[PDB]
Amino acid sequence: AIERGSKVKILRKESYWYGDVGTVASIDKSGIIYPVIVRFNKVNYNGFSGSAGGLNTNNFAEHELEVVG
């Protein structure tokens, strides 16, 4: 299903938020492998090069997210 603003348990092995749950923000109808951008209260600020800081939203495919509600 993957609704908007629903609780989705991230199932990405190599991921800073694997095993946690992010708030779905919006899906992308482009065709990439991770068009669904999820939300995460967590933030990043440890060695992030010289371009912006903290991600806040990660990328995940439909089958990569486990919408539980």
**What is the DSSP track for 2-21?**
--TT-EEEE--SS-TTTTSE
Output the domain CATH number for residue 18.
2.30.30.50
Q: Rounded to an integer, what distance in angstroms lies between the CA atom of residue 46 and that of residue 27?
A: 28
* Residue 22 to residue 57: CA distance in whole angstroms: 8
Domain of residue 22: give its range: 1-69
| Burial (CB count <10 Å: 0-12, 13-18, 19+), residue 19 | exposed
CB atoms within 10 A of CB 38: 26
The span from the CA of 32 to the CA of 47, in Å, is 27
Chain breaks in the chain (C to N over 2.5 A) after: none
Classify residue 32 by its DSSP letter.
Answer: -
Q: How many CA atoms lie within 13 A of 18 on its CB side?
A: 6
Q: How many domains does the chain have?
A: 1
> What experiment produced this structure?
NMR
